[model samples]
Target chain A: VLRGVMINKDVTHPRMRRYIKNPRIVLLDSSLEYKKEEDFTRILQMEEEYIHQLCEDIIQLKPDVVITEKGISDLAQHYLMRANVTAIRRVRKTDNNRIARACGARIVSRPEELREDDVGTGAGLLEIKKIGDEYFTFITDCKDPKACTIL
Target chain B: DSCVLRGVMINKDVTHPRMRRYIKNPRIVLLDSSLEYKEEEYIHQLCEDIIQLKPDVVITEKGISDLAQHYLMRANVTAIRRVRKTDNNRIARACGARIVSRPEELREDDVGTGAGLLEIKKIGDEYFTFITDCKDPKACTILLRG
Candidate 1:
């Protein structure tokens, strides 16, 4: 018998020990690496400053899961892990939208616009687990998983 | 657009529309998995649940049956099947809707809004669905000739 599996860029990232029950997810199509919302910053220290701001913004959201369509900087990932958030980056737009709807959160373009109200709410469990040989972020407990299955 | 939607059911089973027009605050549902129930009671009950959702449109990513379409049409819900996977997320954000992981969890809140219109148009050889009037559309369908 044979099987299939879904994996990410690398398994070096951490996985959740338990399924995140009622996860507050954040989906970002835009990158977390920002230069300056305002046209002013230190030339030599701006990189660290932007990363600091990025981490703060995400930490403020208190997300259980974070899905982004763009890349995640090393510092941002570190901060998310410190916050105990399972974050996925470079995700397909389709998957990102799916996660948002499942959680009832809105996709905010500008990171500044993120608020508690923008977070979606739904009964579900999200976790990254090993499937066969690789890891996949599985979002389960959806009321109506849309595709057809031969059960 | 008056009928904004989220979950897209990408079904390959395309059919003729009974009413040819649906205008309402559509409740859209997208399924990541496949529909497994095919028994008589199962289909019947499923149809009933769908009606309760008051869905204006149902999109399928895989395939659907004539029976399913017939059931949806009864509730005046237009359906589109075989939607490209990439396009799934695009349409969802464009209409301010999100893709549902499962169908059963579908609620009124899961239904997004903002499109001015939700109607399909026919060209010489294919069909095109126009979801317009979004305050700000995230993605758009570009019919490229090249």
Candidate 2:
């Protein structure tokens, strides 16, 4: 089974809730973390330019659904909201895998490498619905839910 | 000399400006997988524990987290995350470092010594980290960017 993104109950306010229709879906396996070079007798550092362009990369993809393994930063959340994308974070590996397969989307590690075909495509409606106290997401009205939900 | 300056190519973003990182003659930590912290008890603790070792630089084959960065930076460590598999091996061999799969297994002995300098350079919107000036110089880095 694939993995899913987890939303904090109290954190995702009604005003914070966003929905999109047939939007481009992006599933990320890693968080947007920063690690510089190490501190030792010699000097070493890794460039950090990629993280800054992360949201811009997502924006270019025009993703409608954004799910990641780690929490989404405020800047990224703002960008997605402006684009009318549903952003979900802190998902488990298993859940994310299941959801990606269900929605016909694959996880992307880098934003610069994100391609037009990388976003999941289908004729179904993707939405975030308030299921009880939690806001759950589902891909409905697809012509081929079988391929997505074969399990 | 041609292959010694091995670089683990990252297809993704591996840095943050707030990580408080910069170093010289750094010790290196290599991981074969992602550092995306799960909800496991040990995972968080592992992040805390590993930072205590205080290596100069860290290279992961997978992604990392901001929280992990906090600890690493607090301890003055620089990190390169989500490196390619082939590059990881080459980097380990070039730097004389061993790749540790688990955080618990990270030890001083496991940390490799980089012979030279690793510096993060920012050009406009592009960032390039150069690792060079090694002793006995088996290999080095040459990165091209847009």
Candidate 3:
């Protein structure tokens, strides 16, 4: 089976790590960013630079399929489009309007939608979703998405 | 005036999910060797196709960003280091396109990252981002031809 890798590219995300599920030794920051305006500003700045290397490193990782946190869809789209691999835009709840629009990857809603293919989950600036293997599903509550809601 | 990418590389699956959901989003978990091999193959083939097509822009999952950066630099193709994080110095120096790698320097009305093009264009200038629905949806939108 093709091993899938979900990339939480939202380096600026305050509580970014909280959104992903991985067991390997964590390499990036281990903590989450609180929803502080100050933190948000700092995190945004951090993401501007972090994004470049993150994408390159992701390249080095060479995932069979790549799924990223929502918003950075444009970033993921750019990379995936260039590479010619299938990209699924993993949209999720986030406050960053710019990031959501810029990273225009293929739209995928939350996992709840995956169960019934919810229409609420598609490409939009203000919605929660995810993309993997040409599929998108809505995931509820930005962080800790185990039983992610679709609608 | 399109994105000119060259070395853009691609990687398939890089990590596992079932095991990584205990905490924050997992970026460190790497794809297994077998999966990496398959992903690498996918990257190779994908890269070849990208190169063959000679597109102005290049893309990748999470792994092969270096391939895109280096490839574009080698070919002197302007690269747009897309932003996901806040600050990435390495990509800034390598690729010279829109979207500077510094969020501190960001302007609210700034256009999307054009890699190197960011430096070359001015707001509402000739080389700025132009968004019109592509003539065809299935085909290239904004029609960026290298």
Chain A TM-scores of each predicted structure, in the order given, are 0.75, 0.71, 0.28
Q: What digit string (tens of lDDT, one per residue) describes model 3 on residues A9-121?
A: 32323222222222111111111111236887888777555545445544454322234344343454455345432333332334122222222222233221121221122
For the predicted complex of model 3, DockQ is 0.01
The sequence of per-residue lDDT tens digits that candidate 1 reaches over residues A57-136 is 87788887777788777767777788787777787766566566656678876567899978765536665543222345
lDDT of 2 at A84: 65
Per-model CA lDDT versus the true structure: 0.58, 0.60, 0.28
Q: What ranking emerges by lDDT with the best candidate at the front?
A: 2, 1, 3
TM-score of 1: 0.42
lDDT of 3 at A76: 42
Which is the leading candidate under lDDT?
Answer: 2
Off by over 4 Å in 3: A1-151, B1-49, B76-133, B137-146
lDDT of candidate 2 at residue A139, scale 0 to 100: 54
Q: Supply the DockQ value of model 2.
A: 0.01
Cα error, candidate 3, residue A117 (Å): 50
* Local lDDT at A64 for model 1: 76
Tell me the tens digit of each residue's lDDT in model 1 across B42-129: 6666656656777677665655566766887777777776677666665676566667645667777666575556656442123455
